[PDB]
DNA sequence: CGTACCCCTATAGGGGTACG
DNA sequence: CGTACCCCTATAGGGGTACG
């Protein structure tokens, strides 16, 4: 499970997720549609082999990735 | 925002959420139905003024509640 | 309090295609 | 890659009643 294997934008989303933001807020924050955010989210989840955004949030904090 | 304001069972749920577990898994781990888990989660969220289980997980880690 | 439902809407997520 | 949608099911959440 390596964070370097993610694309920049995927790391942008993971960071906002780890801060507790719902997809709609992440979209407004990055000024892109929720649709696009949701695409990055599932790509990130599959790559990192995580089952949900909460697991990604927890993982990011436990492993102090950011 | 104080963790002591929650009931014991609500802290039980909060801990499992901060470990990234979905409600169904929390029910099986605690040996209660998913319905009951959802009640505790709902109560916990309102009392702690959190908008989602993700904010609850992120809060627990940032403030090192547990 | 903790248990376990009911009702409903909102959010998330997993597959796909398409195109600068 | 990043964008933005399509499809769908799954999960989450907010209100309620009930009862030992």
UniProtKB/Swiss-Prot annotation, chains A, B:
Known DNA-binding region: 23-42
Residue stretches making up the HTH luxR-type domain: 1-64
Function: This protein activates the expression of the nitrate reductase (narGHJI) and formate dehydrogenase-N (fdnGHI) operons and represses the transcription of the fumarate reductase (frdABCD) operon in response to a nitrate/nitrite induction signal transmitted by either the NarX or NarQ proteins.
Name this protein carries in UniProt: Nitrate/nitrite response regulator protein NarL
Naturally occurring in which organism (per UniProt): Escherichia coli (strain K12)
């Amino acid at each position: 499970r390596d964070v370097n294997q993610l694309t920049p934008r995927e790391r942008d989303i993971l960071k906002l997720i780890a801060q507790g933001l719902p997809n709609k807020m992440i979209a407004r924050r990055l000024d892109i549609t929720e649709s696009t955010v949701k695409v990055h989210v599932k790509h990130m989840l599959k790559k990192m082999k995580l089952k949900s955004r909460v697991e990604a949030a927890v993982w990011v904090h436990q492993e102090r990735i950011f």
